[PDB]
Amino acid sequence: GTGRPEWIWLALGTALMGLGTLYFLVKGMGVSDPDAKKFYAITTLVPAIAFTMYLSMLLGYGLTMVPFGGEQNPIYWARYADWLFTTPLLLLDLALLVDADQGTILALVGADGIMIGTGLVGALTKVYSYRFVWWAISTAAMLYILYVLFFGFTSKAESMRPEVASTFKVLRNVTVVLWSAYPVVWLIGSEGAGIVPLNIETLLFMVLDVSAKVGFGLILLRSRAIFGEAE
Ligand SMILES: CCCCCCCC/C=C/CCCCCCCC(=O)OC[C@H](O)CO
Ligand SMILES: CCCCCCCC/C=C\CCCCCCCC(=O)OC[C@H](O)CO
Ligand SMILES: CCCCCCCC/C=C\CCCCCCCC(=O)OC[C@H](O)CO
Ligand SMILES: CCCCCCCC/C=C\CCCCCCCC(=O)OC[C@H](O)CO
Ligand SMILES: CCCCCCCC/C=C\CCCCCCCC(=O)OC[C@H](O)CO
Ligand SMILES: *C/C=C(C)/C=C/C=C(C)/C=C/C1=C(C)CCCC1(C)C
């Protein structure tokens, strides 16, 4: 375990996702409003899944070796299993906040599946140049998601309760900034051009993950927007 220099960041990420899970679980104890229950369920599941996958990387299960560029490169595949389930859950939190139509939700979740699935194929591809073909397709899927969040969701939120509009705007801005950093880290890190070493890459993903899951959830679950309008 400690033989890998990045272990300290995997351990800290495990601890922070675990603590985030427990906090959201206790905070949601006793909430009875059915609308608020939806948001607590979605938002608590996100760090719980990430906890299990950080733990699997810490213990060494979620790591494989991929040959490319004449070397055996360590690839943490467990990240993609986490993101496959947690990134559509985070998009569902945003879509439910603005009462998105069903067709738009399907488009978002489908594009997200394509983004993570092609990222995984790129991470495991043995022909070096082809890794960047998959990165470009995945990045195009991400740009579709970001477009919808700005030129689809923002338009509907502005016609809803003011507390829904303001909370959405903040969570939208947090999401766009944090999610856009992931393709950059991948491209310059061990999966891509290899300019940043794996230990620093692991630190960067851990800061992004904790911010995009526990930070996001703290903003959402402290908002009055998750409760129905009632007397
Ligand atoms: C919110 C409060 C928390 C604030 C925290 C946010 C900081 C996020 C971390 C960033 C990257 C820093 C990585 C450290 C730099 C290591 C690079 C290095 O030293 O490599 C030298 C090499 O030997 C010769 O080039
Ligand atoms: C050190 C602590 C480690 C961290 C803990 C280990 C994580 C894996 C454990 C459990 C799944 C528990 C349930 C996860 C689902 C929670 C959903 C929820 O809370 O739903 C609220 C809603 O209001 C209901 O109607
Ligand atoms: C609303 C959506 C609900 C979503 C709830 C789903 C959460 C499941 C999470 C985690 C366990 C990780 C499972 C990862 C499976 C890896 C098994 C595998 O393929 O291993 C192959 C072997 O290691 C050859 O290398
Ligand atoms: C493997 C990746 C895919 C599986 C991972 C799970 C990701 C989240 C699940 C589903 C989106 C499907 C559409 C669900 C949107 C329905 C929300 C809605 O419009 O409201 C319906 C409700 O009946 C009103 O009361
Ligand atoms: C819209 C928000 C999301 C946008 C996300 C897409 C951004 C893509 C950016 C840049 C490509 C820059 C490529 C630079 C890579 C050159 C690496 C190289 O070969 O240089 C070797 C090294 O510099 C010698 O030490
Ligand atoms: C909880 C973790 C989050 C919000 C992770 C988000 C991940 C991404 C937006 C990943 C994007 C990628 C690309 C657009 C191309 C290169 C490969 C990925 C998967 C890193």
Author numbering: 4 to 234
Can you provide the manuscript's text about this entry?
The primary function of bR is that of a light-driven proton pump, where trans to cis isomerization of a covalently bound retinal chromophore starts a series of conformational changes necessary for directional transport against a concentration gradient. Structurally, bR shares the seven trans-membrane α-helical topologies typical for other rhodopsins, as well as G protein-coupled receptors. The primary reaction from the bR dark state to the K-intermediate is the isomerization of retinal from the all-trans conformation to a twisted 13-cis conformation that stores a significant part of the initial photoenergy. Here, we investigate the effects of increasing laser power density on the light-driven proton pump bacteriorhodopsin with a focus on the K-intermediate that accumulates just after the excited retinal chromophore returns to the electronic ground state.
